Amino acid sequence: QPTNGVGYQPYRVVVLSFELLHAPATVCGPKKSTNLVKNKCVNFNFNGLT
């Protein structure tokens, strides 16, 4: 009821669970991709592994 005390009110809940496996990514962050480079020393990120 709207008259309930603060703890006795309803609350909505969401729980987000991450399948953070060493496997193909399918949900990823709001981020770009460069061209690939070979035979040169470079800093790199693949799917958030750096």
Place this chain on the structure above:
Amino acid sequence: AYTNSFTRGVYYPDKVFRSSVLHS
């Protein structure tokens, strides 16, 4: 009614590539 499994039923424990290693 029975038969014996021998060395059946091993499976890949994780989605990682490895080579020439005695993993445990």
